[PDB]
Amino acid sequence: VERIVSRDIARGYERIPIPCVNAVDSEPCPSNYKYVSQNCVTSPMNIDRNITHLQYCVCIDDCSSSNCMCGQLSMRCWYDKDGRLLPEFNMAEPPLIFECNHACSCWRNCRNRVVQNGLRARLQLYRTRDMGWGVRSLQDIPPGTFVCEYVGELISDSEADVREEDSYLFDLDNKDGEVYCIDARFYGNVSRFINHHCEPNLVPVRVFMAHQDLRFPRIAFFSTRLIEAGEQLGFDYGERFWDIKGKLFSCRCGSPKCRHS
Amino acid sequence: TARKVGRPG
Ligand SMILES: Nc1ncnc2c1ncn2[C@@H]1O[C@H](CSCC[C@H](N)C(=O)O)[C@@H](O)[C@H]1O
Ligand SMILES: [Zn+2]
Ligand SMILES: [Zn+2]
Ligand SMILES: [Zn+2]
Ligand SMILES: [Zn+2]
């Protein structure tokens, strides 16, 4: 019925493959970018990797207790036993998540470890009728689930201001006011292909793992509700994006509450 | 100028 134009765009780099299918036109699997499973740089970011600067926990358990320092950094550890965000998690103004790290006394299978375990959902790159390429889930995803990370090239504020191919930028704005950006234009993972939706089934959360340099949160998408098998993924690109692109095209997310139609 | 078309919101 369709055309399986790839068995895995990640070439085996993700825990689970991410095929590409096109059921709509003759466009072959996208190849104008380099798939990378983790953030890269093409120009020094002086990410603070000094291991003695990490805050870490000394838990003698599985990091379920109120005493876990890494949990305290996050407000509380928001993950349940299955790895899902607690119902009480604020998806409107998500807190910063600090996962346990290699400086912690705890074990690798501790509770406070989710994003760092990589992809667990079966996803698929497919051709949409209205929006170019998009990503859909191939199975039921429960709410509060880690789905994928927004991966690309870490660049500076001012370098980002000169990028002419600007449809793949993700701004990292510190609470301190400092700003960097992830550009998935040339180097990126499956998240570069996730389209905007006005009623999103995904929310991005800033997460820290092997480093705690606050200029460089890593961006994790968690489901905000049950996503059904076959359902396209989407998050809210936000207002800064639309104030600019809205001059060139309109949102075709198709929602009856579409805010950018 | 304009500005930059970054996510999110
Ligand atoms: N909700 C939406 N309505 C209309 N176009 C959208 C959209 N969400 C994403 N897009 C399109 O996708 C771009 C973001 S990059 C997202 C992946 C893109 N569909 C691709 O095929 O590579 C936008 O600039 C716009 O071209
Ligand atoms: Zn702990
Ligand atoms: Zn810890
Ligand atoms: Zn731990
Ligand atoms: Zn819309």
Side-chain angles (χ1 to χ4, degrees), chain A residues 2-6 8-128 131-163 165-246 248-256 258-261, chain B residues 1-2 4-9:
Chain A
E2 56 206 8
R3 181 54 182 85
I4 304 171
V5 306
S6 185
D8 180 13
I9 59 176
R11 299 171 333 280
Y13 273 84
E14 307 282 7
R15 295 182 59 184
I16 287 133
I18 304 176
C20 183
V21 306
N22 187 347
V24 165
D25 57 49
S26 65
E27 276 300 319
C29 169
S31 61
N32 70 331
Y33 76 105
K34 181 58 184 184
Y35 193 102
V36 295
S37 58
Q38 323 194 319
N39 296 320
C40 60
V41 295
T42 67
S43 183
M45 304 292 116
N46 312 109
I47 296 175
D48 180 13
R49 304 194 169 276
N50 183 339
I51 194 174
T52 67
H53 287 184
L54 280 172
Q55 288 184 266
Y56 61 90
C57 72
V58 292
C59 298
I60 62 181
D61 66 338
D62 66 342
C63 296
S64 295
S65 100
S66 54
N67 284 222
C68 181
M69 169 65 30
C70 307
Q72 289 288 321
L73 293 174
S74 312
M75 298 300 97
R76 51 176 298 181
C77 171
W78 296 102
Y79 301 129
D80 76 22
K81 20 277 136 201
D82 281 17
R84 310 192 176 313
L85 288 171
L86 291 173
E88 24 231 292
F89 178 83
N90 191 13
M91 308 212 141
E93 297 217 60
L96 304 189
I97 300 189
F98 292 82
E99 298 198 345
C100 281
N101 54 77
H102 51 291
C104 291
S105 298
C106 52
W107 288 58
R108 179 60 179 79
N109 69 346
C110 106
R111 190 200 205 81
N112 195 29
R113 293 181 197 266
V114 180
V115 176
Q116 68 188 248
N117 294 333
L119 191 63
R120 305 304 302 130
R122 305 199 177 270
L123 303 179
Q124 183 195 69
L125 183 63
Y126 74 113
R127 186 73 164 173
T128 60
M131 282 164 289
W133 296 101
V135 189
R136 68 159 140 249
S137 175
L138 296 182
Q139 85 190 350
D140 269 20
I141 306 175
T145 308
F146 173 62
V147 177
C148 54
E149 179 184 341
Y150 197 88
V151 172
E153 183 189 356
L154 274 37
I155 62 184
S156 66
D157 201 15
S158 87
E159 165 70 24
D161 274 329
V162 312
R163 293 283 168 105
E165 307 205 56
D166 58 359
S167 323
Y168 300 99
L169 297 170
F170 204 121
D171 287 338
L172 317 175
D173 311 0
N174 205 350
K175 215 179 126 173
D176 139 273
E178 218 8 62
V179 52
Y180 288 77
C181 183
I182 309 182
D183 184 2
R185 167 56 181 86
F186 301 102
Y187 304 94
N189 73 337
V190 70
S191 290
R192 82 197 293 285
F193 294 112
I194 290 173
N195 288 311
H196 168 88
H197 196 285
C198 293
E199 309 179 280
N201 51 28
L202 295 179
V203 62
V205 175
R206 288 155 155 251
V207 185
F208 295 94
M209 285 152 282
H211 73 81
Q212 295 172 344
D213 189 330
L214 298 176
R215 299 172 290 163
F216 308 97
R218 288 167 49 183
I219 305 292
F221 297 110
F222 292 82
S223 64
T224 66
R225 66 176 165 79
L226 179 78
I227 296 170
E228 297 186 326
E231 206 179 334
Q232 175 175 206
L233 304 188
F235 68 104
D236 184 349
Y237 285 12
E239 204 55 47
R240 171 186 309 153
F241 176 94
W242 286 105
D243 293 347
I244 289 149
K245 293 304 204 177
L248 293 154
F249 60 83
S250 294
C251 170
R252 212 171 280 88
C253 81
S255 182
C258 173
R259 287 175 278 103
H260 304 281
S261 80
Chain B
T1 184
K4 204 179 53 209
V5 24
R7 306 136 157 90

